[PDB]
Paper text:
[name] is a cofactor of the cytoplasmic exosome in budding yeast, functioning in both mRNA turnover and non-stop decay (NSD), a surveillance pathway that degrades faulty mRNAs lacking a stop codon. The C-terminal region of [name] (Ski7C) shares overall sequence similarity with the translational [name] (trGTPase) Hbs1, but whether [name] has retained the properties of a trGTPase is unclear. Ski7C is organized in three domains. However, a suboptimal polar residue at the putative catalytic site and an unusual polar residue that interacts with the γ-phosphate of GTP distinguish [name] from other trGTPases, suggesting it might function rather as a GTP-binding protein than as a GTP-hydrolyzing enzyme.
We solved the structure with a selenomethionine-based single-wavelength anomalous dispersion experiment and refined it at 2.2-Å resolution to Rfree of 24.6%, Rwork of 21.7%, and good stereochemistry. The refined structure (referred to as Ski7C-GDP-Pi) includes most of the Ski7C polypeptide chain (with the exception of short disordered loop regions) and also includes GDP, a molecule of inorganic phosphate (Pi) and an Mg2+ ion. Manganese was soaked into the crystal prior to data collection to substitute Mg2+ and to unambiguously identify the position of the divalent cation in the electron density using anomalous scattering. The γ-phosphate of the GTP-bound structure and the inorganic phosphate of the GDP-Pi-bound structure are adjacent to each other, but they do not coincide. In the case of the Ski7C-GDP-Pi structure, the complex either mimics a putative post-hydrolysis state (e.g. before release of the Pi product and conversion to an inactive GDP-bound state) or engages the small molecules supplied at high concentrations with the crystallization buffer (i.e. GDP and inorganic phosphate) to mimic a GTP-bound state. Except for a loop approaching the sugar moiety of the nucleotide that is involved in a crystal contact in the Ski7C-GDP-Pi crystal, the structure of Ski7C is essentially identical in the Ski7C-GDP-Pi and Ski7C-GTP complexes, superposing with a root-mean-square deviation of 0.53 Å over all atoms. The work we report here indicates that the C-terminal G domain of S. cerevisiae [name] possesses the structural features of a canonical trGTPase not only in terms of domain structure, as expected from sequence analysis, but also in terms of conformation. Both the GTP-bound and the GDP-Pi-bound complexes of Ski7C adopt the conformation typical of trGTPases in the active GTP-bound state and show an overall similar nucleotide-binding pocket.
Numbering used by the authors: 255 to 476, 492 to 636, 645 to 747
Write the structure that this text describes.
């Protein structure tokens, strides 16, 4: 196989991450978009609807149940886990893929997954979904620490001074509940536009507003109606352009060292002298091909495993896909099932694998080698902005990095004798892991971002930054 040629025939991907409070209409809208993009067969729908007969009458609808596909989510009536859907069809630009990602707005689960989804997937586009119904909009803006502002406190400040520019779509959803109240939609747009510009430093070219109804599908593409006074674009038309302009992008895949994030892990049973581990892997950079030797580094201090890639398949997705056929090569940013073969050195019943979410996988460096750090004392290059109360030294914080979030202690504010972090500062800071026998896996490379977010124990954003390896 050419290998070099496989990278060429690979379609260029755009990732869209959906964010917003619970009941914003995210799951409904995203499922509806998938239907409009002909990713759901009428038969598939009705089979979903034949199951939905349970819900007549009910609050739920036919579109959200597409994404809320776990039994616990259907019973609870809201999303709990992030859903990743990769779309590739004739409605998109040729040689491209559109990755859509649903996230939970329910705060308990928002804190568990949504913040990490931003760091892990590193999306080109954010989609903020807002319920514009009467009273709902007003109730969702209590103080400077409301959930919507918390979202903006992250995505507004990630990768400042970056070459590639930011892209934000604000969806003014449930427009039908207000009958497209022109004065009200104008108000909400006015208010957000101000806060985005004045407080979060967004520029006109970096964001736009789109009123819509995910349930009715109004203004998603191409009483459902778009008022005569609306001159703006549809949601999908804008996604289409973003994908198109993302085509003209530099691909350094060949120069990139292979790095993967383990999203899920399962050891095949019964265990034996040689064991086989099934991994759901998000490729962060470079490329992986079956047969290659690899290293699996765990969150547990040290404790790395050597193995070989036995086979690779497409990840089990919400949309109907082929999980039977093997894949020759895995390329950034696709997600693959990876079966890893691992020889145990000693007794195999005493020693057992401790592979978990957030663990990483790289190509083998067994004897320009890839630099890898296992850090308990972590140096952070951060920048603060609006801050209610300064953060004094010795404070307990939560360090979000890639897929993991760990409690840390603030131990040193470098460059100054100050004993507290203050508003609007660019600081260098050291934090120390609290959890015993735990170490943060950090890859030192020009190709890896290592973005972080510091929050309080109450999950309120304090700062954004990067791991300072040097
Ligand atoms: N009237 C109206 N209701 C909606 C719309 N989108 C969602 N909903 C309702 O909002 C509730 C929660 O929607 P959901 O898709 O789960 O939003 P999520 O919680 O943010 O993921 C559901 O019971 C829907 O009936 C819309 O465009 N119009
Ligand atoms: Mg949802």
């Amino acid at each position: 196989i050419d290998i070099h040629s496989f990278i060429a025939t690979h379609p260029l991907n755009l990732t869209c991450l959906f964010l917003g409070d619970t009941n914003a209409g995210k799951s409904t809208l995203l499922g509806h978009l998938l239907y409009d993009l002909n990713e759901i067969s009428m038969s598939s729908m009705r089979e979903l609807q034949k199951k939905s007969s349970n819900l007549d009458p009910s609050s739920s609808n036919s579109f959200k149940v597409i994404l809320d596909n776990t039994k616990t989510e259907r019973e609870n009536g809201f999303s709990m886990f992030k859903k990743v859907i990769q779309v590739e069809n004739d409605l998109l630009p040729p040689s491209s893929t559109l990755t859509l990602i649903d996230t939970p707005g329910s705060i308990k689960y928002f804190n568990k997954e949504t913040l990490n989804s931003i760091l892990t997937f590193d999306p080109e586009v954010y989609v903020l979904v807002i319920d514009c119904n009467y009273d709902s909009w007003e109730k969702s803006l209590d103080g400077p620490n409301n959930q919507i502002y918390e979202i903006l406190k992250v995505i507004s400040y990630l990768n400042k001074n970056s070459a590639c520019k930011k892209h934000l779509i604000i969806l003014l959803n449930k427009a039908d509940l207000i009958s497209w109240d022109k004065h009200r939609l104008e108000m909400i747009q006015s208010e957000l536009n101000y806060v985005l510009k004045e407080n979060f430093q967004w520029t006109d070219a970096e964001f736009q507003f789109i009123p819509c109804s995910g349930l009715l599908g109004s203004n998603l593409n191409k009483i459902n109606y778009v008022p005569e006074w609306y001159e703006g674009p549809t949601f999908f038309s804008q996604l289409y352009l973003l994908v198109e302009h993302n085509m003209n992008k530099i691909e350094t895949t060949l120069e990139e060292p292979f790095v993967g994030t383990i999203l899920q892990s399962s050891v095949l049973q019964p265990i034996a002298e040689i064991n086989y581990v099934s991994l759901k892997v998000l490729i962060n950079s470079g490329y992986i091909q079956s047969g290659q030797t690899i290293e699996i580094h765990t969150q547990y201090e040290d404790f790395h495993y050597y193995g070989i890639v036995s086979r690779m398949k497409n990840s089990k997705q919400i949309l109907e896909t082929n999980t039977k056929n093997n894949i020759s090569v895995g390329l950034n940013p696709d997600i693959l099932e990876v079966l890893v073969k691992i020889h145990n050195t000693e007794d195999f019943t005493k020693k057992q694998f401790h592979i978990r979410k957030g663990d990483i996988i790289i190509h083998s460096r067994k004897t320009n080698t890839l630099k890898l750090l296992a850090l308990r004392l972590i140096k952070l290059s951060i920048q603060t902005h609006a801050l209610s109360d300064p953060v004094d030294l010795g404070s307990e914080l939560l360090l979000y990095h890639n897929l993991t979030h760990n409690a840390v202690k603030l131990v040193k504010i470098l460059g100054t004798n100050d004993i507290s972090i203050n508003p609007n500062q660019s600081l260098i800071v050291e934090v120390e892991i609290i959890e015993p026998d735990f170490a943060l896996n950090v890859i030192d490379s020009k190709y890896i971002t290592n973005n972080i977010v510091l929050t309080s124990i109450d999950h309120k954003v304090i700062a954004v930054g990067r791991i300072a390896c040097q």
